[PDB]
Every structure is written in C-alpha cells, then in structure tokens.
Design an enzyme around this catalytic site. Structure first.
Site, PDB file in Angstrom:
ATOM      1  CG  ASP A 242      -2.369   0.870   0.280  1.00  9.11           C
ATOM      2  OD1 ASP A 242      -2.901   1.688   1.086  1.00  9.11           O
ATOM      3  OD2 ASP A 242      -2.627   0.857  -0.946  1.00  9.11           O
ATOM      4  CB  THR A 243       3.705   2.752   1.238  1.00  5.43           C
ATOM      5  OG1 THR A 243       4.613   1.636   0.973  1.00  5.43           O
ATOM      6  CG2 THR A 243       3.041   2.533   2.629  1.00  5.43           C
ATOM      7  CB  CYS A 348       9.449   5.293   6.873  1.00  4.30           C
ATOM      8  SG  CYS A 348       8.938   3.883   5.885  1.00  4.30           S
ATOM      9  CG  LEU A 349      12.205   0.643  10.580  1.00  2.00           C
ATOM     10  CD1 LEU A 349      11.635  -0.579  11.289  1.00  2.00           C
ATOM     11  CD2 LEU A 349      13.736   0.579  10.755  1.00  2.00           C
ATOM     12  N   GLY A 350      11.220   1.328   6.019  1.00  2.69           N
ATOM     13  CA  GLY A 350      11.169   0.961   4.614  1.00  2.69           C
ATOM     14  C   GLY A 350      11.525   2.076   3.629  1.00  2.69           C
TER      15      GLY A 350
HETATM   16  C1  HEM Z   1       6.236   5.843  -0.235  1.00  2.00           C
HETATM   17  C2  HEM Z   1       6.558   4.970   0.670  1.00  2.00           C
HETATM   18  C3  HEM Z   1       6.217   5.051   2.159  1.00  2.00           C
HETATM   19  C4  HEM Z   1       5.793   6.055   2.918  1.00  2.00           C
HETATM   20  C5  HEM Z   1       5.369   7.460   2.513  1.00  2.00           C
HETATM   21  C6  HEM Z   1       5.777   5.584   4.319  1.00  2.00           C
HETATM   22  C7  HEM Z   1       5.377   6.349   5.397  1.00  2.00           C
HETATM   23  C8  HEM Z   1       5.528   5.872   6.700  1.00  2.00           C
HETATM   24  C9  HEM Z   1       5.153   6.663   7.877  1.00  2.00           C
HETATM   25  C10 HEM Z   1       4.594   8.085   7.803  1.00  2.00           C
HETATM   26  C11 HEM Z   1       5.539   5.961   8.940  1.00  2.00           C
HETATM   27  C12 HEM Z   1       5.315   6.321  10.437  1.00  2.00           C
HETATM   28  C13 HEM Z   1       3.915   6.131  10.955  1.00  2.00           C
HETATM   29  C14 HEM Z   1       3.655   6.549  12.394  1.00  2.00           C
HETATM   30  O1  HEM Z   1       4.463   7.326  12.953  1.00  2.00           O
HETATM   31  O2  HEM Z   1       2.503   6.232  12.754  1.00  2.00           O
HETATM   32  C15 HEM Z   1       6.143   4.738   8.504  1.00  2.00           C
HETATM   33  C16 HEM Z   1       6.509   3.669   9.313  1.00  2.00           C
HETATM   34  C17 HEM Z   1       6.884   2.410   8.928  1.00  2.00           C
HETATM   35  N1  HEM Z   1       6.990   2.001   7.629  1.00  2.00           N
HETATM   36 FE1  HEM Z   1       6.950   3.249   6.017  1.00  2.00          FE
HETATM   37  N2  HEM Z   1       6.214   4.291   4.326  1.00  2.00           N
HETATM   38  C18 HEM Z   1       6.521   3.923   3.065  1.00  2.00           C
HETATM   39  C19 HEM Z   1       7.006   2.706   2.661  1.00  2.00           C
HETATM   40  C20 HEM Z   1       7.230   1.600   3.443  1.00  2.00           C
HETATM   41  C21 HEM Z   1       7.733   0.332   2.981  1.00  2.00           C
HETATM   42  C22 HEM Z   1       8.060  -0.019   1.498  1.00  2.00           C
HETATM   43  C23 HEM Z   1       7.829  -0.454   4.046  1.00  2.00           C
HETATM   44  C24 HEM Z   1       8.344  -1.912   4.157  1.00  2.00           C
HETATM   45  C25 HEM Z   1       7.420  -2.864   4.192  1.00  2.00           C
HETATM   46  C26 HEM Z   1       7.393   0.326   5.218  1.00  2.00           C
HETATM   47  C27 HEM Z   1       7.595  -0.102   6.529  1.00  2.00           C
HETATM   48  C28 HEM Z   1       7.467   0.709   7.634  1.00  2.00           C
HETATM   49  C29 HEM Z   1       7.663   0.291   9.003  1.00  2.00           C
HETATM   50  C30 HEM Z   1       8.239  -1.095   9.384  1.00  2.00           C
HETATM   51  C31 HEM Z   1       7.337   1.321   9.778  1.00  2.00           C
HETATM   52  C32 HEM Z   1       7.318   1.393  11.320  1.00  2.00           C
HETATM   53  C33 HEM Z   1       8.509   1.817  12.097  1.00  2.00           C
HETATM   54  C34 HEM Z   1       8.246   1.873  13.626  1.00  2.00           C
HETATM   55  O3  HEM Z   1       7.052   2.030  14.011  1.00  2.00           O
HETATM   56  O4  HEM Z   1       9.247   1.871  14.291  1.00  2.00           O
HETATM   57  N3  HEM Z   1       7.183   1.602   4.818  1.00  2.00           N
HETATM   58  N4  HEM Z   1       6.031   4.660   7.113  1.00  2.00           N
HETATM   59  C1  LIG Z   2       1.056   4.538   6.372  1.00  2.91           C
HETATM   60  C2  LIG Z   2       0.877   3.597   7.577  1.00  2.91           C
HETATM   61  C3  LIG Z   2       0.098   4.558   8.496  1.00  2.91           C
HETATM   62  C4  LIG Z   2       0.242   2.192   7.266  1.00  2.91           C
HETATM   63  C5  LIG Z   2       0.233   1.471   8.675  1.00  2.91           C
HETATM   64  C6  LIG Z   2       1.590   1.975   9.301  1.00  2.91           C
HETATM   65  C7  LIG Z   2       2.189   2.923   8.176  1.00  2.91           C
HETATM   66  C8  LIG Z   2       3.239   3.821   8.765  1.00  2.91           C
HETATM   67  C9  LIG Z   2       2.616   2.005   6.994  1.00  2.91           C
HETATM   68  S1  LIG Z   2       3.751   1.762   6.594  1.00  2.91           S
HETATM   69  C10 LIG Z   2       1.303   1.481   6.359  1.00  2.91           C
END
Ligand code: HEM
Ligand SMILES: CC1(C)[C@@H]2CC[C@@]1(C)C(=S)C2
Length: 405
Positions: A242-243, A348-350
């Site tokens: 979904d991102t 974001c780790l991803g």
């Molecule tokens: C355009 C791509 C993406 C955007 C804009 C995005 C945005 C975000 C945001 C805003 C958060 C923090 C949410 C919070 O504070 O509630 C986050 C956390 C996270 N995202 Fe990304 N994300 C993206 C891609 C991905 C991808 C490809 C993965 C890998 C599957 C992913 C894995 C994670 C994880 C593991 C966290 C949690 C880290 C933690 O809570 O310590 N993300 N993402």
């Molecule tokens: C954009 C989100 C809010 C959704 C759930 C956690 C998040 C940070 C990722 S990666 C997918």
C-alpha cells in the site's frame, strides 16, 4: 454524519474535515488536504467527522506531537477509534522504550543492507515491466506498473506466492482506504488468518525470507512470540502493498503533465535524487495520528485524555512556513522539508527501499519512454484515507518516440 461536540472543544476550533472524503477531492488529494492550511483555519482544529478528533495543521505542531510520545501515544494511531483500537501492529502501536526492540528486528528485514542485496532484482523487474509496456503506446499505469513493480518485489522479499496478491491487496486497501465493505477488525482478522499458518510453518522450517527472519527473531534477549511475529508481519504487508504503489501513481501523473520536468531529469540525471525528495514532499500521502495519554495543554488548546489527534505527515511539506510555494514542483529547492516517512521514533524503516524503487522507476521509465501523456478524456480520480491513492492512470505515448534498451 457529524458527532456532537464534546464539552472541552471551543466552537471556534471546529473545522469539519473528513479525512476519508475531503471536499475538494476533484482538485487532487494534496490540494483537498491543503484547505486545512488556509488563513481562515486555526493551527489545531477539531473535526466532528469520523467520530470527532483533533487535527494539527502545521509542520511545527506535527513534528512536536511526533516527538512527544509521552503525551501522544501510538497505542491508537488510526481514526476512527474502532480502527485505532483494533490496531495492534508492531512496532507501530508501541511507544518507546518497548518499541525499540521490535524496530531493531523489523530493520533487519527491510533496512539498507536488504536494499543493497535486492538492488539487481529491483532494476531487473523495472526494466522488464517497462520494456514490456513500451511498444504498446498505452497502459493503465496503476494496474500495469505501480502495483506489480513494488508488490512483486515485496512478494519476493517475503517469500509469498504472487498468486496471493489480489486477496492481500484487497485486505490492505480496506485498512487505509475503507470501502464500507468490511470494518478494520474484520479486515485485520482476514489478514491474520492468512499469516498464522505461514508463520507456524516458518518457525518449524525457517527460510531466508523476511517472514522466516521475523518468526525466528530475538527481542529483549528472548524469542519473539507467534502473536508478535503475526503483528509485525501484518504491518510489513501493509507497508509493502500500500505505500510505494500509490506514490508512484501521483508522481507519474505529475510527470505525464509536465514535459519540462521530464526533460530536466533526462538531461541532468544527477538531479534524480533531489527530484525524488521533491516529489516525496509534493506528493506526500500518509495521514495517521496519536492518542492523548492525559490531559494536556498543547499550544494553548486543552487536549483531553483519550482524545485522538490526526498528525498528517502529508501536511508538513505542504506548509508555506516550511516550503515557499508549496504546490509548486521545484527540483532545485535549496531545502526540501517534509515528514513524508514520519518523524520521531516511528520514522519509516522501509524508506530506503521506497527511495530505491522510486529512483529506479524514474531513471528507467524516462530512458525508454521520454514522452508520454494522460489519455485524452481520462479524468484522474484521487482517493483519500490513511494512505491516499489514484484510482486509475491511463497513459498514452507514440511508440516511435520510445527507446529500446
Ligand atoms: C512511499 C513509501 C512510504 C511512505 C510514505 C511511508 C510512510 C511511513 C510513515 C509516515 C511511517 C510512520 C507512521 C507513524 O508514525 O505512525 C512509517 C513507518 C513504517 N513504515 Fe513506512 N512508508 C513507506 C514505505 C514503506 C515500505 C516499502 C515499508 C516496508 C514494508 C514500510 C515499513 C514501515 C515500518 C516497518 C514502519 C514502522 C517503524 C516503527 O514504528 O518503528 N514503509 N512509514
Ligand atoms: C502509512 C501507515 C500509516 C500504514 C500502517 C503503518 C504505516 C506507517 C505504513 S507503513 C502502512
């Protein structure tokens, strides 16, 4: 469907914003959100929609709130409350110090070193998908590339069958952009039904895939539980599916409309990395929040314990106080200020993975298909939610202006 105003909310702070169906959706999703940043809008408003919740509108407040986990907890990060309540992903529904151990593991799986190892496949898949499209002179970018590209890579990383895409993608969509077809808990449950057997299988006989590494991981000196593994994997799935998928569509829609931006990237490729940041700022798409752990006075507004607050990551970079001419795409901005990938302990780790996927796509697409546009008479519809999206992106191009590689 407005919820009755709680006693503590000053009537002057009311602004009835529907995160799921904002008013000027026709103008584009980012523009529909940006209404919150007009001069008539206080920095911190209460909306009566989706059960009633606060919304911080300014990058300054969003960052502060994100930093302050003591007051703003991740326990219930989704709106509406029933969704935030059902929400039990790890690390996302945890606050430090507890979060840290789980983050370290998730990091093993998605971080830099994984990106570095997968680099060749990312490049291989992008080139193959593009080349396959090139001679057609037309696609549905959302179905034809934006979906397959990032998904197939996640599928590979996770060691899951491509056959599961449709089922999975449906469930993930229900979470970020609720249809009304299913509630959060129902959707959450169906995803969990999916993962349970797999995790089981991978605790017994480990592989090298992400699920295998999570299922067999160590957190705070002991082994992760099955339930904990299920809850991390659930998050990984939503992030993977979904991102990147939605982001690419916003970006590709913009490029389709802006010859001069395409050319810039073709002639001065050293600029790609900078343009990728600028696009991440302009086409930011995530909005979640936090829950008040207690009564707290934040920038002169009294927040009550249990109050949810939306802290739209999307909004920071669109804020004029942070970026001059926010709605303008400028690859040569001195400072690209955003919080697209979040802020504070949940960053974001991803992100590393996302950036690699974006940069590859830009480079590879522009290489073969330098000149393209939106199909005549296609109306592009955006969709709002936790993660915003583009319904369909019909593109056209003359094959004779393409370049085989
Ligand atoms: C355009 C791509 C993406 C955007 C804009 C995005 C945005 C975000 C945001 C805003 C958060 C923090 C949410 C919070 O504070 O509630 C986050 C956390 C996270 N995202 Fe990304 N994300 C993206 C891609 C991905 C991808 C490809 C993965 C890998 C599957 C992913 C894995 C994670 C994880 C593991 C966290 C949690 C880290 C933690 O809570 O310590 N993300 N993402
Ligand atoms: C954009 C989100 C809010 C959704 C759930 C956690 C998040 C940070 C990722 S990666 C997918």
């Amino acid at each position: 469907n407005l919820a009755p105003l709680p006693p503590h909310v000053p009537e002057h702070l009311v602004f009835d914003f529907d995160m799921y169906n904002p008013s000027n959706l026709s103008a584009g999703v980012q523009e529909a959100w940006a209404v919150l940043q007009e001069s008539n809008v206080p920095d911190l408003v209460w909306t009566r929609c989706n059960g009633g919740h606060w919304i911080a509108t300014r990058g300054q407040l969003i960052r502060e709130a994100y930093e302050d986990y003591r007051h703003f907890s991740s326990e219930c990060p989704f709106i509406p409350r029933e969704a935030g309540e059902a929400y039990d992903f790890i690390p996302t529904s945890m606050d430090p110090p507890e979060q840290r151990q789980f983050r370290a593991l998730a990091n093993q799986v998605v971080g830099m070193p994984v990106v570095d190892k997968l680099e060749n496949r990312i490049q291989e898949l992008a080139c193959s998908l593009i080349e396959s499209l090139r001679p057609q002179g037309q696609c549905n970018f959302t179905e034809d590339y934006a979906e397959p590209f990032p998904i197939r890579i996640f599928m590979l990383l996770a060691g899951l069958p491509e056959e599961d895409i449709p089922h999975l993608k449906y469930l993930t969509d229900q979470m970020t952009r609720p249809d009304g077809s299913m509630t959060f808990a129902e959707a959450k449950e169906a995803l969990y039904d999916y993962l349970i057997p797999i995790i089981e299988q991978r605790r017994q006989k480990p592989g090298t895939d992400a699920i295998s590494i999570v299922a067999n991981g160590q957190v705070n000196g002991r082994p992760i539980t099955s339930d904990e593994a299920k809850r991390m994997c659930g998050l990984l799935l939503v992030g993977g599916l979904d991102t990147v998928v939605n982001f690419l569509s916003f970006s590709m829609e913009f490029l389709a409309k802006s010859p001069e931006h395409r050319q810039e990237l073709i002639e001065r490729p050293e600029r790609i990395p900078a343009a990728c940041e600028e696009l991440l700022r302009r086409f930011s798409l995530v909005a979640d929040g936090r829950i008040l752990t207690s009564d707290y006075e934040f920038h002169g507004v009294q927040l009550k314990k249990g109050d949810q607050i939306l802290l739209p990551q999307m909004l920071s970079g669109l804020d004029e106080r942070e970026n001059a001419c926010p709605m303008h795409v400028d690859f040569s901005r001195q400072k690209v200020s955003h919080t697209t990938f979040g802020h504070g302990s949940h960053l974001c780790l991803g992100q590393h993975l996302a950036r690699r996927e974006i940069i590859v796509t830009l480079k590879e697409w522009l290489t073969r298909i330098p000149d393209f546009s939106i199909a005549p008479g296609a109306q592009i519809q955006h969709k709002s939610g936790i993660v915003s999206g583009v319904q369909a992106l019909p593109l056209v191009w003359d094959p004779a202006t393409t370049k085989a590689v």
